[model samples]
Target: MDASTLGSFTGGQLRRLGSVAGLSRADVETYAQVLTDALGPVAQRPLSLAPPTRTFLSDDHTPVEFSLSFRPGAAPAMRVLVEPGCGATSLADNGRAGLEAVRTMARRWHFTTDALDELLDLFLPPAPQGPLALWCALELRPGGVPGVKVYLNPAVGGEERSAATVREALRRLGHHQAFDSLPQGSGYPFLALDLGNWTEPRAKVYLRHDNLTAGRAARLSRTDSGLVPTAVEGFFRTAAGPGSDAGGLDGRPAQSCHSFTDPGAERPSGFTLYIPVRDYVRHDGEALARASTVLHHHGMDASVLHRALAALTERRPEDGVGLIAYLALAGQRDQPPRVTAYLSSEAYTVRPPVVELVP
Candidate 1:
């Protein structure tokens, strides 16, 4: 279908805004305050989701296509997957190239108190879209047309992964619904992890009104986009960087990886939100070579790759750093790139220099 084609797929979703109209402003405000009170303070920090290194896909039928949205003021970096070619059929038919590109370009937001009003209006909507839902079974795309229609309620799916657990964490720190607290029929299964002291140290709880539909959110899912080839995925787990306890580059202790799947394993294709960590990098040439050797085994250039990191050393020279400093994975091609990685250490040797790690 051409871009202008308004088939049932697109037409159905266009009215989504109306579905939300019946909701009230006061309702949204309640959740907003709940988030503000629950999460305490969402640590202000850098959300570095930059341009991604390219990985081409071979399968057209794989569920590697979807569109997701997020608002992190009451910050829950949550993602809701749409089946491939839903309302966006043209992009779906285009497949691999289109999906990969769209998935890679995600937006980043910083929620602050000043934006409270806006936050409320966004995440605190009524039934059918409240709380946060991981799996959506809505009538947005009628006749099996893949489109996101407004006002359509999403049925309960999964363990209420994002909505229930997120609120629990917030309350533990203490916060769901179109209003906070668990609502009827919303799939909000709780987590055992303690939520208080979310800002204990380097606060991991990034709270923002997720969607304002009934909550706030950030859409970040791997497989809903496309997936990492299993081999490469293994490399990320087993191949420790310069500062590993298992021993530098040789940190090959048996690794275990649990892939993410929707409730019924019902996604278009698999994906990975591969954001190679950003932190201090080690620029030691020997470590570079060591890392290179490791990659070589994985079919990447141990030498050319070494040079790449070495060049980055000049760009991000680690000065007055620790043994774990420079030895970082200069992650996915990003703006204002930063580095971070792990490998064997306690060697009493200086940390490696800042050489950007590229795969």
Candidate 2:
């Protein structure tokens, strides 16, 4: 179908096409145009109705292994294995920790301690029920390029509430006027991961207040925001630079980012956040190619046809270091184009970054 004809199809018709062909209308249009462009108009030739002579299968695969080491019960150690083509295991450990830390820090940074106490009192109302969660982000390096790892603990209940209560008590001691502008429905505060820690040993904590909200839950399910594509583009730009830093070209940072949204399976709307980390040794081309390989091997790369997306979101020289963070937020907000986080680590080591949690 031509671009104009494809564009004229109604959403219902598109849905029908998607259901019958196991491909979304958008996917069909994209593939049609791509095939036509590459193979000429012969792509429009009528088929014999039977399957084509050569059935195409994706051959992009790479092996990746990740091992988590915990100090006894300090945390749970785990091993992850991916076949030639499979989705990546959610780095849930890091995600949970990073989220917790960001929430905690945001509360403390934005509110007075006493104000925080009152806000918690109003939100929880009755004695707090349910478990409290802690999210953390750890940074293992410094400079313009850095590496970051995130970790999270499931709701901590039982005696863990005591620590939370103690934190509240301390906040109550600080000031009474702090509660003036508190938002309704706000509950115990939490921390958010920091963007600067890509260059240092860092960690942050946060609490989860919106866990019960459908929107929030849906958002969580969509955290896979095409990192592979972003990384690939990042790699390409870095390779073309003459004086790039460890994180990328020109000493800019490359953020490890994620997002959450649920407008629909095909298109969603919501928010995303990212933390920048450095991987100094690998230049842009190396990093992008390796990251693409990692994602391709794991199979998730095909979910969104990332290679094309990467090409569309090419980086510019004037983007500067903050580009990483901007890209992360823009993706979450569903703004077109792309945003990026700068690299801040100087070494090639791996470690959890710092995230601060409060309230």
Candidate 3:
């Protein structure tokens, strides 16, 4: 998490990066305020999209689906979705009770269509058993607007595959080097899954994806230095098994499967998760102190400091937690501009863990 690694970052860039890191708008705003207050004035406004100059592509792309339940009074509580195109039927139940029924089905079935039956046990759970929200479309209109249609599901497979796909998409969109490389002396950026009492054995998987276009095949020449190949090979190697030059899935090495690809190369625009080694530690007291000092300088309260540390440690260790650190190298007249650090680990079954700066 050195300041020198962040390079140049604009407010829009930060927003984009935050989105790629799986952060919501509120999360980004809180971090932005902390950085600006402590590090001096910096951009915090959202970015306007630029129109697409070329036609985007999207056909036969693999669609992903995600499902999770949220109970009453959950922090960062989940919102119930109801949209015309989303295909959610029924009009009577639309409040907490309705949403609860859907959550129940999602948890029971886990990842099978049988889950839909669980929903039917009750008064016909929304035609779809999973979350009603739609996924981001592949097309971008003249004003750089997202396409109208939404994806039914976008949360399946391991995080490595999801991240690799995103990296490949970004590269195709012409944003090369959007992700930071694994720092020297730092272990490879990986996701570790905790299989209960350390007995099941912990799984570690390293991954990197490619970011190149069809016509720009020459760009492939730089694959070695890019994040794409680095992430892909890392995951592939781990999955390949012991002494096999690849990494493992949970703890034991697994076999490599199919390669990753963008859903639509023509209008390539996606995101990837960037996990830094610092985030994976049990608890680097000194590092936390340094982070606290930066937070204090920005006018954050002592309570805020303790909460941030607790969220990183007490709450969950294996999950992906994002922290806003100062990026001096970016050189934007601001000293401690925010750069997010993700705690990479094996707990990718749910959403990436997060902690936002509080006022």
Candidate 4:
């Protein structure tokens, strides 16, 4: 497969990734079709799918990331997340391009973009400034319109003003409790809104905490949010496994919370926590092992993750930095626990001085 400015992977490589991630033949076919119609046009643009170099820019980065979601008794789903990076000379332009990508994909998938468009507008021009990174998650399944989600960089203007920017966006959307729930001294890194689905709208904000112990991270998950304290702690323990308290796992991980709410609602209808599992493990091998364990313990199939790790790269799973970037755990409002793993393409190493990995 030949590499390009759009990304390190060719269409065949993308299909291989999806295939190894446990998507059935039919699912992989559908994924390819959706991607062609959605990202094909944009691929010709100047953007580099993954960061071209690790040191290119700190705040301005990464146009693409991929993942697979495994839930009990449900088929695994795949997602391609993109943030319009190339040709985006300014942050505002990047935000606009991000929205355009959302619209393009929504239309191609035959989903309504109105609700999400309105919600996104609340953060644009009239408020403060656009998002530093605006991302869209195209969730693919076998059938109907693919699920879509928009993630915003809270501190568009700068990191110091992150909280204020999120506060203003929440205030405009009438998500008062979400605004009040922000952790003191914690910077908001990402804000997200679920779109393209008929379900009740959901929004999430990510709070960054540097170098936290597992216990500390778990306690923080339930901070001002309505999540069960014990449940949160238990999840942190299970995800971290054997030596969680040893403090070996603290490297810029954020405990993110999501809320299902309608406009003008003071409190959310439901809440859940998203933790970066990669932070807790030593490498990709350990990450996959922990994920397999979590899936087995939860009554889900662990082989799905095993297949995915094998499919992700040519190098041993034991050899990477962030093959599995995040492991999200969700169980709020009495809902059953669910796990989603976000995999990094690592087109170029996330470490300084871009180094291309073999396809």
Report the number of the highest-lDDT candidate: 4
Off by over 4 Å in 1: 1-238, 241-264, 267-287, 310-359
Worst 10 residues of 1 by lDDT: 209-218
How many clashes in each structure? 66, 82, 29, 1
lDDT of 2 by residue, 61-132 (tens): 111112121121222122211111112122232233324333443443331223222333322332322222
- Residues 40-159 of candidate 3 have per-residue lDDT tens digits of 211121112221111011011111111111111222111111121211232222212233433333354232222122212222223422322222211111222111211222112223
TM-score, predicted candidate 1 vs. hidden true structure: 0.23
Q: lDDT scores for all predictions? A: 0.23, 0.27, 0.25, 0.62
Instruction: For candidate 2, report its TM-score.
Output: 0.20
Residue ranges of candidate 4 with Cα displaced over 4 Å: 1-10, 20-27, 36-62, 119-122, 125-131, 174-177, 182-185, 197-200, 220-228, 238-243, 246-249, 269-272, 349-359
Q: Model 3, which residues run further than 4 Å from truth?
A: 1-126, 131-247, 251-307, 311-359
What tens digits encode model 4's per-residue C-alpha lDDT throughout 244-294? 566634555545665646677664544455556666676888888777776
TM-score of every candidate:
0.23, 0.20, 0.22, 0.78
Among all windows of 10 consecutive residues in model 2, the one with the lowest summed lDDT is 55-64
By TM-score, who's the top model here? Answer: 4
Root-mean-square deviation per candidate: 22.0, 23.6, 20.5, 5.2
Model 3 earns a TM-score of 0.22
